[PDB]
Design a protein around this ligand. Structure first.
Ligand code: GDP
Ligand code: MG
Ligand code: MG
Length: 166
């Protein structure tokens, strides 16, 4: 059969969860996507010559939250490079996912979004060290320019693929 990967995009409000997801799906940049919108997609894609079903959930910032954390197989942990609080929040999101999953090994990718912006308050060295501390990849993205957007989602799929063989 066809392989299925449930991906969940998490992160503080305004970091670009929706802009990243809409860029992936629509190849369009959204300026004003309502912050209450939770949008989920079932889409067939080809990654590394293997076709799979991606179930992608763009979260909006309690019983339902634990529900989509239980169901999610890999998590895009998004922060914005001009928002130090969103970067500091990553460890809280990570801990909460592991708590809900009741598992210490959850596939994740660290995403630093809005890299097109001049205002940078998160040092890339600290983003690299945070990803290193977690043992996960770190990808710099711009949903405005589409830089790294496909890489971020496809990398998470590859991480789930490796997790399933362990
Ligand atoms: N310059 C720039 N703005 C972005 C980027 N990603 C998102 N935004 C803007 O940040 C605001 C919040 O983005 P949104 O995707 O709605 O954030 P969400 O709350 O995490 O879903 C919107 O005005 C977006 O246009 C980016 O990569 N670059
Ligand atoms: Mg949103
Ligand atoms: Mg618009």
């Amino acid at each position: 059969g066809m392989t299925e990967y449930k991906l969940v995009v998490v992160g503080a409000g305004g970091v670009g969860k929706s802009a990243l997801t809409i860029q992936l799906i629509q190849n369009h940049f959204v300026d004003e996507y309502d912050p209450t919108i939770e949008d989920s997609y079932r889409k067939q894609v080809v990654i590394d010559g293997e076709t799979c079903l991606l179930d992608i959930l763009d979260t909006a910032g309690s019983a339902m939250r634990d529900q989509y954390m239980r169901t999610g197989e890999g998590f895009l942990c998004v922060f914005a490079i001009n928002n130090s609080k969103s970067f500091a929040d990553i460890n809280l999101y990570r801990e909460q996912i592991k708590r809900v999953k009741d598992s210490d090994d959850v596939p994740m990718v660290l995403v630093g979004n809005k890299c097109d912006l001049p205002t940078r308050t998160v040092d890339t060295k600290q983003a690299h060290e945070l990803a290193k501390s977690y043992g996960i990849p770190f990808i710099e993205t711009s949903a405005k320019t589409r830089q790294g957007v496909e890489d971020a989602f496809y990398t998470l799929v590859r991480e789930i693929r490796q997790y399933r063989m362990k």
